[PDB]
Each structure stands twice: as C-alpha cells, then as structure tokens.
Design a protein around this nucleic acid. Structure first.
Lengths: 65, 65
DNA sequence: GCTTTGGGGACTAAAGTCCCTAAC
DNA sequence: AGGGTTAGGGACTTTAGTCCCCAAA
C-alpha cells in the first residue's frame, strides 16, 4: 500500500488506470484534455519506477485486493 | 476463474500480459514474432469481450488472487 | 513572485485490427 | 492428402508515452 508520494489525483489516476480505461476516457471522468492526461500518467509511472500503464494497473489492482 | 475458451497458450498470454510486458517482450518469452503476438493477444481480447490489453491484465490479476 | 495544477508542440513508439497466406 | 492448428506478413489507424516549455489561479 505504498501510495506515499502520489498527489491528490495521482491516487485517482491509479484507480482509473486499473479500470483499463483510455487516457481520453480517464480524461472525461476528470474534465481534462487527453494531452493533460498523457502527462499526469507518464509522470506517475516515473514516480512508480514503471514504464507502462499496464504495470501501474496491475500494481494498483494488487493494492485494491 | 473463467479460463474456459482460452487455448493452451492463451492462458499463458494472460500471465505474461499480467506482468505488464510488451508484445515484443512477451514474444521473446514465447519465441514468436511481435506481429504474431499482436494477433494472438488481439484475438484473446475479443474472446474476453474486452478491447484493451490493460483490461485483460487486471482481470487476469484478479484471478491470480 | 511563486507553487500548484492544466495543456500545446512535436513526435517516437507501441498497440490494435483485419484479412489473407504457408507450414506442419 | 484435403484438413485443422500454429505462426506471421501487409498495411494502416489509434493510443500511449516523452520532454520541455507556457499560463491561469
């Protein structure tokens, strides 16, 4: 449960990622632009030591359980 | 645990997918080409009623636990 | 005069889709 | 030997991702 380091919405970029959504879908759910999302997510992977959104999801998926 | 329908290696295309690997990484671990894997995976998502490999992975991740 | 917090530019690269061949 | 698996090319269209810099609050 190492969610220490993730901003407000970065922990909520993990739950949307873990529902195998697309940047643009996750975008609408948050009122951003897809470009904005691409950024936040790509930062978040860096913060996580991962290089693919899929790893983030599975990792998130493991926390939720 | 609905792995009924999945061929031999389709159940193993779900364990590799669930490690957030890439078609080409997955393809090395299976001795295929990346093109070959693009196809297998894409079929497998159809068989699963999903349209994005991330979904597959999370779903797979939920079975493993 | 700064921190958050949102997004364009500008691509490089993965992912996916569909349909159609060969090799056992 | 005309058939099912099992593997991949063609040929793109879409999402993802990367970095770095730019304004509003």
């Amino acid at each position: 449960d190492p969610l220490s380091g993730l901003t407000d919405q970065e922990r909520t970029l993990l739950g949307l990622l873990s529902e195998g959504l697309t940047n643009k879908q996750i975008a609408d759910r948050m009122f951003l632009a897809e470009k904005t999302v691409k950024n936040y997510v790509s930062r978040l992977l860096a913060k996580l030591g991962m290089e693919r959104r899929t790893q983030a999801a599975v990792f998130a998926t493991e926390l939720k359980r």
